[PDB]
Paper text:
A second subdominant CTL epitope, S598 (H-2Kb-restricted, RCQIFANI, spanning residues 598–605 of the S glycoprotein) also elicits an appreciable CTL response; however, S598-specific CTL exhibit ∼100-fold lower functional avidity and do not protect from CTL escape in S510. We modified epitope S598 (S598Q600Y) such that it elicited a high-avidity CTL response and using the crystal structures of the H-2Kb/S598 and H-2Kb/S598Q600Y complexes, determined the basis of this enhanced immune response. As we have previously observed with other MHC/Cys-containing peptide complexes, complexes did not readily form unless the cysteine of the S598 peptide (RCQIFANI) was modified with L-α-aminobutyric acid (Aba, an isostereomer of cysteine). We also performed structural analyses and showed that enhanced immunogenicity was associated with changes in the conformations of both the peptide and the region of the MHC class I molecule that is in close association with the peptide.
Therefore, we substituted a glutamine residue for tyrosine (Q600Y, CAA to TAT, RCYIFANI) at position 3 of the determinant with the aim of creating a peptide that bound more tightly to H-2Kb. The structure of H-2Kb/S598Q600Y consists of four heterodimers in the asymmetric unit (rmsd of 0.09 Å for heavy chain (HC) Cα's), the four copies of the peptide adopting virtually identical conformations (rmsd of 0.12 Å for all peptide atoms and 0.05 Å for Cα atoms). S598Q600Y displays the same conformation as the S598 determinant (the average rmsd for peptide Cα atoms between the two structures is 0.24 Å) and forms equivalent interactions with the MHC. In contrast to Gln-3, the Tyr-3 side chain is oriented towards the α-2 helix rather than the floor of the cleft. In particular, changes in the conformation of Ser-99, Gln-114, and Gly-151-Glu-154 are associated with the bound peptides. Changes in the side chain conformations of Ser-99 and Gln-114 in the Q600Y complex structure are consistent with the loss of hydrogen bonding interactions with position 3. Most strikingly, the Q600Y change resulted in subtle changes in the conformation of the α-2 helix locally in the vicinity of Glu-152. These subtle changes are likely critical for the enhanced TcR recognition that we detected. Replacement of the Gln-3 with Tyr-3 (Q600Y) did, indeed, result in an determinant with increased thermostability without diminishing the CD8 T cell response. S598Q600Y elicited a response with higher functional avidity to both the cognate and native determinants than S598, and this was not reflected in differential Vβ usage.
Numbering used by the authors:
A (entry chain M): 1 to 8
B (entry chain A): 1 to 277
C (entry chain B): 2 to 99
Amino acid sequence: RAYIFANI
Amino acid sequence: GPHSLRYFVTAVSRPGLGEPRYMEVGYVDDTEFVRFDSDAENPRYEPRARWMEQEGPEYWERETQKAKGNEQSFRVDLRTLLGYYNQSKGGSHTIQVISGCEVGSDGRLLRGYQQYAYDGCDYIALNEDLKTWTAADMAALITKHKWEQAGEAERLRAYLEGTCVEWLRRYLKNGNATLLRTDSPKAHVTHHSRPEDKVTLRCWALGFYPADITLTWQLNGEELIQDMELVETRPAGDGTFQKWASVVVPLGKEQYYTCHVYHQGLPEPLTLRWEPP
Amino acid sequence: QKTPQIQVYSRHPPENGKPNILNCYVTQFHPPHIEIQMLKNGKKIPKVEMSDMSFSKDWSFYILAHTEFTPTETDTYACRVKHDSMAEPKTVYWDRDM
């Protein structure tokens, strides 16, 4: 499962 | 030995031609196993190794939406970086991410990866301590500050120590026999002319997996470094790889040179010479 | 911005008259937009497949372009690459010994 990335 | 679950992420803007293109590409130990590509009216997570087909309709449903989510996040992210770098609206730009865990055979986390890059240059990354950030410039310092005040490092740490490790274990149980596969190289030497009294001997290795391999030419004893020529290992395109290394020897002396092929699938290194029929 | 490395090679050792596969392996480039043609005797090969795009630990992109072909004694094949890092396109001819 891929991480749910944060906005930069 | 150790294993790793990594995600390769790409977001590529392309003004006045359409939405940015987004991809999530999954890797268990350098083998790609999942891919998502936003170029489609109804884009979907896909299996890229046969053993992944074991996962149920729900797994793909769940991943697909998550990626779709991620994509939208990166659409904003591209717009944001233009704001940070003060760049004009019409350029194509690229965000790249490497995200995942490396776990030992004991099941402990050896190191974690969260590496961001903007236009092929390091942007920000999580330190080995899994708690702080390294930013490559004034722009990323703004992303550092935002992730400090939302405690992003902690949320990431949790994913690395939890979801990442846990799933890498789930994946490994499904595809372990496959990933472990090993194809020994087959080697031949070829002979080619060269102006006058010199000839080229070329030592080939073909049909091997994985890609790691070492080819060396020896003369009467010691190895040939300074003059030897080789190419980057390259895919045959059927899952195997290929490579060669060659050396310019005196005409009539070919039989005095030995090629050694070193690969992990070999009971022992291969030794061969040029064989004139 | 990074200039692409090109390799043109067949999948199996070439043998005149026997079908094989010609590979164009393009690596080390950036940005990820690239145009890859394969030419036969100067003319564009119409049906060329591309692997999905990927990149490496150092951020650079790679892709494998391949086409079905039957090597002759005299046919010349090449791979041609357009990419923003280069003022002009880059052609590499297939060498069967290589």
